[PDB]
Copies of this chain bind each other. A is one copy, B any other.
């Protein structure tokens, strides 16, 4: 058993949003089978960020999803060999982000490398004007396809002037070696910002995530 009750992770992101380049480094920890993890991030280059932190938050840890016995945990089964994931986030005002990540296990610690490109965000929009107030709790729809696991989520960012800012997530989870695939199921998640300095250069996050079948099934 390579995925222990307690596992630590290191994450590094290299990104670009509306032409602004940045680098983020971080360290995280959590309980893989209990469905929760924390992460501490630091902007190492391109700081302070001229956009909302919230668009970066869901990109900083697959192995921390609590899965019941009957639904195979594809993401956990991918280790020690390796794991990769990719995502497209379609924002309602035209913004589009594509993310690609590489996950490896080195000496009982997960190493995550994230590449992020965000484009077409309006200048007067909530992302560029930093008007977002965190994510609402979400429900991902997962299904197997092409030998990999795919997920779709209808997410929303809370606005300070009131209301929501809609984002559609489409994710593809790829194990290095094709491991056991689950059926049609759901993953409930909730990401919260627990700490931050004034310009969001140092941020701490907490995520709660649990996989399940549909309530009627």
Are A98 and B118 in contact (CB-based, < 8 A)?
Answer: yes
User: Which B residues are CB-close (under 8 A) to A147?
Assistant: 123
The reply to whether the CB of A4 lies closer than 8 angstroms to some CB of chain B is no
Interface of A is mostly: strand
Are B215 and A188 in contact (CB-based, < 8 A)?
Answer: yes
Are B120 and A86 in contact (CB-based, < 8 A)?
Answer: yes
How near does chain B come to A182, taking the closest CB pair, in angstroms? 13
Out of B137, B139, B170, name the residue touching A120 (CB < 8 Å): B170
Are A97 and B94 in contact (CB-based, < 8 A)?
Answer: no
Are B172 and A156 in contact (CB-based, < 8 A)?
Answer: no
Residues of A within 8 A of B (CB): 16, 18-19, 84, 86-88, 92, 94, 96-100, 102, 115-120, 122-124, 136-139, 141, 143, 145-147, 152-154, 156, 163-164, 166, 168, 170, 172, 174, 184, 186, 188, 190, 208, 210, 214-217
Are B172 and A137 in contact (CB-based, < 8 A)?
Answer: no
* A-B CB contact pairs (8 Å), 10 listed: A19-B86, A96-B170, A98-B117, A99-B117, A100-B117, A117-B117, A120-B170, A141-B156, A164-B184, A188-B215
Are B216 and A137 in contact (CB-based, < 8 A)?
Answer: yes
Q: A87 to B96: give the CA distance in the assembly, Å.
A: 9
